[PDB]
Amino acid sequence: SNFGVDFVIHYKVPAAERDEAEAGFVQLIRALTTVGLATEVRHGENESLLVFVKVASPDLFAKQVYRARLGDWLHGVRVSAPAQALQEPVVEAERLRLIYLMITKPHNEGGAGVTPTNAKWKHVESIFPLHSHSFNKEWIKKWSSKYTLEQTDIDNIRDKFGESVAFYFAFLRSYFRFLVIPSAFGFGAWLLLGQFSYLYALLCGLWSVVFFEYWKKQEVDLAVQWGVRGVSSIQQSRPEFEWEHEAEDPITGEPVKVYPPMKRVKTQLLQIPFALACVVALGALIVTCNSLEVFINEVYGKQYLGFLPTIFLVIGTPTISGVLMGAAEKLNAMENYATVDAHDAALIQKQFVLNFMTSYMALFFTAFVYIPFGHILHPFLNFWRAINPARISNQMFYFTVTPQIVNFATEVVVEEAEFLQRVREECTLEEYDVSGDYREMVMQFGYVAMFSVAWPLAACCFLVNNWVELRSDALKIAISSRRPIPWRTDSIGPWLTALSFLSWLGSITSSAIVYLCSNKAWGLLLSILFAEHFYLVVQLAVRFVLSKLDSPGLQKERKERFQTKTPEEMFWQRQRGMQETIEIGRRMIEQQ
Amino acid sequence: SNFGVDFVIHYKVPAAERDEAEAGFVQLIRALTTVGLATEVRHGENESLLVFVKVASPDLFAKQVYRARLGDWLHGVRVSAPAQALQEPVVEAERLRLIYLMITKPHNEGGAGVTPTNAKWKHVESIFPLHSHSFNKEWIKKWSSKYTLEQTDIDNIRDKFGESVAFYFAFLRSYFRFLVIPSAFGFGAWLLLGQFSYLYALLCGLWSVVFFEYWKKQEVDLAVQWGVRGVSSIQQSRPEFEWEHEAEDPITGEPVKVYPPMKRVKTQLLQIPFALACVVALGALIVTCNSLEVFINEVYGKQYLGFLPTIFLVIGTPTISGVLMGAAEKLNAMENYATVDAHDAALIQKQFVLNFMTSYMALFFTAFVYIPFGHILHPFLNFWRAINPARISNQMFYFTVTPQIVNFATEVVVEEAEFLQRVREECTLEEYDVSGDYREMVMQFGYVAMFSVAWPLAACCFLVNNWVELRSDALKIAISSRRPIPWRTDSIGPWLTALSFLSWLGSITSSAIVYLCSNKAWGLLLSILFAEHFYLVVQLAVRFVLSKLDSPGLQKERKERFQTKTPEEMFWQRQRGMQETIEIGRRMIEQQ
Ligand SMILES: [Ca+2]
Ligand SMILES: [Ca+2]
Ligand SMILES: [Ca+2]
Ligand SMILES: [Ca+2]
């Protein structure tokens, strides 16, 4: 039970530079009082001083809310611009978002910049909302005692934690529900269809298309249901953006904050050497592991040891990749991005490329380098001094079951005093990052899309993992993280593109595997061509079918629209009246 | 010099059924007088009676215009809803469009239904606007004395003949200008690069992508420049639509006009037997022609006779296809379409399929059936009783130069008395159909995209033909057709899709030809794969590049937007003021 505290600011103050901090402390408090926020300073753990921030008067917040609504209508995410009409009430998500905007936005936008990165607030560590322990307990208990989740649970998640967390949980729920179809015909193929079935690959591609398009429709439906349809158009300035000078684009009077694009491109070009070095190092590691496993297969008991290195490889996956992820972040911090959307998209692209490598390159080597060309691992036995087509199937099994275990291990198993202690322990937790969960789900989807044909049972394992994850991530948000700042998005974002890629490549990969493990380059090229064009045709057909489904968003929009809803002139003086024209026409008929 | 006549209605009246017509004649005149239109009945040629219609009072037309503007703003094609602000004036195109709406729209929409097809007006033949002979003379003289046309000419065409004709002429101008690049490197390949150059095919695919994407951007720019951005969303009811009953969709109170979709699908399924019969008959005709030409090559003088049948084939193209076109129209009249957009799209799709067959199947047979499999025309010499890889090149030459000649032959070389005579001769002319010109240009673009690699000089011939056509179609509209009703479109329509198809297929066709005429299925499949994926990658790259060009529409839109622009409460009673919080914070700093 919180004490009405809306936000908490850390404001670490070390004794080495206390003086510069001390005056800065007052520079904080006044900077809040001018915005109409009541402040509450209290003791902090490890030479810190947490300050609690709440709304001073409800009238100021109502007006702020009204102002926000007006802007949202201006940018087009609202239907009609509405101050005593609150009886659309203010949910906790949007109230917290507006409080964060008041605390964060500069004086130009009616706020007061307390950004903990760019400005003089170098002693402010984190500004975070507090957790509702009763709500978290009820949420966990309700989700852990139900086999399925209706839209009511996702709506509650939206109301409490914002639209980003709600969109992630909706995507996870839809993906888990759609994983039932694939799981069914994967078990069917495993039971009856022998090994490396081509029709299973076709069904997997069809399911990938169907799920991707249906989710693209469902996210639009959800965005319309909430009030966040079109937020992607609203560009948000990044506080960390460093400028060179301020210009004035001759379209508006706004003094834009310019940065030479060529300077940014000169840094973005540093991604190519980084990606090449990462791919070379990981390729060397995977080649070494494959050579060692081939040597341990050739030279002798059980068959579990044959892929023992591969297991270890994935055990090293969350470390190695993690390190790489950090580098990616630094790279994304080196190229300046003036928009939150652009920065997020670039970071997501870099992380997706790195995780794609670290998660799929071993399978790619096993399927398209070792099996077709089984004469390059000669050097393999030569160095280790002291062709099985089921290799890809066993590698897929070990890349399905064991990474699930390692991710579960990483994520799950690893009169005022009580409230103050709770806040103090909350500040040490890490801020929730939904991009990591999105990346994990996208990686699993890619596994299903382009490698489940080797082991069709992978879909069932991923379905069980997704059911467990729908509650594991809820528990992680509830007790293992600070409450995320409630943001607003109309979609899962650039991850959508990733999904499409992982679908398309799947159509080329799966069928190729089917040709390369069931037994001439002509046949392989023909199979790849047929699979890719079948994928494209199915994509067109599914898009056409879903374009004629009459989604609630469209009828809601058209309902709103409906509710809103001399000789040159003597030519006409000859017969000016009414009856004379008819009479003359009748005479003209009689004559001819 | 017209006499201020806005529209002319034919109203044919035969002596066999004059009585039923005679009363119906009055049923016309009153039906116009209620809308506020001055009428003028005069003699007609061949037992007809033309009636001229003009605006009765300028106030009624101004109000009608105002009403139209309000609707356009409601559907979202206008920036802001504006009656004395006419000083955006009324151009001739929109004035004529509103007069046609008054004459055509039923009483529900403020008009009076004088549709010459569905209602009792079975004697009304055509309602057409009159031609401005002075404007036509000036237009032809200006266009025939200039090497290039600026946007001023296209704007004048928009102002006079509406947005459909203007969009066609803009597309033709852009296509002719973009045909310069291809023409240049086609002459380069023809001069130096031997025969069947692969890099020429890659350049042709790149140009197809570039032109298609740049035109997709340019049409959006033109739609924003005019007031027709988003008209595609405005669905227009088709007067010819036959109903079964009227329902009420539970989203609006409008009594929708229902028609069972399954009944329409049962008729749309008749397209498959029709298409199969057409393709079989045309395939038999082309196989017979190819066999006869092969026999006349084998048995003996000149080399012009070898492709003499092929020439004749294209001479039979505008007849045979024409007949098929008529059937297509009847088919499109058999499946009921409740929207003008849907009816137009279906008719365009049927016509495109038929013309695709009749224009490309001979080349497809010569390139992918005769050359690869040169042992199926055995029966060829056997029946005619009484492998050259340059066959495709010569066939492409004869399908370039000669169809241009046949289309030119088909299109070009084949105090009140004077005004009345001019109108009488105008009623006998055929209404201008821009879909035919769009189809011809799309067919030529397909020729360039997927068959110009056989004869690279085809681009220069098509460029000369396009320059001549920019004036030939203008002359056809000026003197060989009635003035089209000024419609409103935001794009060239479904033809866009056709272009994309004719681009994609080109990437598969061109390169295939390069492999099949320069010399193993593996090589052919590899070349097709590389060409198609190069096309897709180039498409993505060009889309990304053009998404960051800052088109005038976007800045105009964002400029318009900018211009529009107890213990639970004692926690805060401990330090309520301003100075006390700072003092206590300083003390807390001093203590720790
Ligand atoms: Ca997990
Ligand atoms: Ca997770
Ligand atoms: Ca012509
Ligand atoms: Ca023409």
Residues 6+ apart with CB under 8 A from A105: A111, A112, A113
Which DSSP letter does residue B591 get?
H
Task: Give B572→chain A minimum CA distance, Å.
Answer: 7
Annotated binding residue B293 = no
Task: Give A582→chain B minimum CA distance, Å.
Answer: 7
The Cα–Cα gap between A82 and A94 comes to 16
- Residue A20 at interface with chain B, using a CB cutoff of 8 Å: no
Distance of CA A293 to the CA centre of its chain: 36
Task: Give B208→chain A minimum CA distance, Å.
Answer: 20
The Cα–Cα gap between B222 and B154 comes to 10
Length of chain B as a residue count: 592
Judge whether A142 and A17 are in contact, CB under 8 Å.
no
The Cα–Cα gap between A244 and A227 comes to 36
Q: Please name the residue ranges forming H helices in A299-416.
A: 308-315, 317-334, 340-365, 378-383, 391-411
Residue type, A149: L
Q: Are strands A7-9 and A127-129 parallel, antiparallel or unpaired?
A: antiparallel
* Residue B164: exposure state from Cβ atoms within 10 A (0-12, 13-18, ≥19): buried
How far, in Å, is the centroid of ligand 4 from the Cα of B440?
6
Count CB neighbours of A110 within 10 A. 13
How many residue pairs bridge chain A and chain B with CB atoms within 8 Å of each other?
125
The Cα–Cα gap between A179 and A467 comes to 10
DSSP string, A56-101: S-HHHHHHHHHHHHHHHHHHTSSSS-----------HHHHHHHHHH
Count CB neighbours of A121 within 10 A. 19
Q: Which residue in the set B522, B575, B578 is minimally distant from A521, CB to CB?
A: B522
Angle, in degrees to the nearest 10, between helices A151-161 and A92-104: 30
Residues 6+ apart with CB under 8 A from B462: B179, B183, B400, B404, B444, B447, B448
For residue A36, give the chain B residue with the closest CA: B578
Angle, in degrees to the nearest 10, between helices A198-225 and A434-451: 150
Residue type, B403: P
How far, in Å, is the centroid of ligand 1 from the Cα of A278?
25
Distance of CA A508 to the CA centre of its chain: 25
DSSP string, B373-387: -TTS-HHHHHH----
Residue appearing with tokens 């953006």 = A241
Q: Which residue in the set B41, B565, B582 is minimally distant from A584, CB to CB?
A: B41
Count CB neighbours of B89 within 10 A. 8
- Residue A587 at interface with chain B, using a CB cutoff of 8 Å: no
A window 206-265, beta carbon within 8 A of B = 251-252, 254
How far, in Å, is the centroid of ligand 2 from the Cα of A412?
9
CA atoms within 13 A of residue B198's CA, in its CB half-sphere: 13
Task: Give B369→chain A minimum CA distance, Å.
Answer: 18
Judge whether A43 and B588 are in contact, CB under 8 Å.
yes
Cβ–Cβ below 8 Å for A561 and B41: no
How far, in Å, is the centroid of ligand 1 from the Cα of A347?
21
Cβ–Cβ below 8 Å for A3 and B571: yes
Judge whether A205 and A537 are in contact, CB under 8 Å.
no
Cβ–Cβ below 8 Å for B584 and A41: yes
Between vectors from CA A191 to CA A188 and to CA A194, what angle results, nearest 5°?
Answer: 105
Angle, in degrees to the nearest 10, between helices B317-334 and B340-365: 150
Q: Please name the residue ranges forming H helices in B335-384.
A: 340-365, 378-383
The Cα–Cα gap between A101 and A401 comes to 44
Q: What is the CA radius of gyration of chain A?
A: 31
Angle, in degrees to the nearest 10, between helices A391-411 and A317-334: 70
Query: Which residues of chain B neighbour A43 with C-beta distances below 8 Å?
Result: 588, 592
Token reading at A465: 């993992």
Q: Please name the residue ranges forming H helices in B253-390.
A: 261-268, 271-298, 308-315, 317-334, 340-365, 378-383
Annotated binding residue A437 = yes
Residue type, A414: V
Cβ–Cβ below 8 Å for B582 and A13: no
* Residue B51: exposure state from Cβ atoms within 10 A (0-12, 13-18, ≥19): buried
Ligand nearest to the CA of A412: 1
Evaluated on CA atoms A9, A15, A18, A22, the torsion sign reads positive
Token reading at A453: 């044909």
Long-range contacts of B291-299 (CB under 8 A, 24+ apart): B291/B377, B291/B379, B291/B380, B291/B381, B291/B383, B291/B384, B292/B384, B294/B377, B294/B380, B294/B381, B295/B380, B295/B381, B295/B384, B298/B381
| Helix, strand, coil share of chain B (percent; to 5) | 65, 5, 30
Cβ–Cβ below 8 Å for A43 and B592: yes
- Give the phi and the psi of residue A230 in degrees, each rounded to 5: 95, 15
Residue appearing with tokens 């940018």 = A75
B window 32-91, beta carbon within 8 A of A = 33, 38-43, 47, 49, 51, 54, 74-75
Please report, for chain B, the start and end positions of each structural domain, with discontinuous segments joined by +: 7-130, 138-549
Report the residue of B34, B41, B511 to disrupt the A interface, i.e. the one with the largest count of A CBs within 10 Å: B41
Method underlying the structure: cryo-EM
* Residue B80: exposure state from Cβ atoms within 10 A (0-12, 13-18, ≥19): exposed
Task: Give B212→chain A minimum CA distance, Å.
Answer: 19
Report the residue of A19, A522, A526 to disrupt the B interface, i.e. the one with the largest count of B CBs within 10 Å: A522
Residue type, A38: A
The Cα–Cα gap between B113 and B110 comes to 10
Closest C-alpha to A448, from A199, A186, A171, A195: A186
Query: Which residues of chain B neighbour A26 with C-beta distances below 8 Å?
Result: 582, 585
- Residue B544 at interface with chain A, using a CB cutoff of 8 Å: no
- Residue A299 at interface with chain B, using a CB cutoff of 8 Å: no
Evaluated on CA atoms B299, B301, B305, B306, the torsion sign reads positive
The SS3 assignment for A44 reads coil
Q: Which residue in the set A520, A559, A582 is minimally distant from B251, CB to CB?
A: A559
Judge whether A498 and A491 are in contact, CB under 8 Å.
no
Which DSSP letter does residue A234 get?
S
Residues 6+ apart with CB under 8 A from A51: A8, A9, A11, A28, A29, A39, A40, A41, A42
Specify which residues B245 forms β-bridges with.
B258
Task: Give B210→chain A minimum CA distance, Å.
Answer: 22
Give exposure, A281-316, as e/b (b: 16+ Cβ within 10 Å).
ebbebbbebbbbbbbeeeeeeeeeebbebbbebbee
Ligand nearest to the CA of B408: 3
A75, A163, A194 from A556: Cα distances, Å: 19, 20, 49
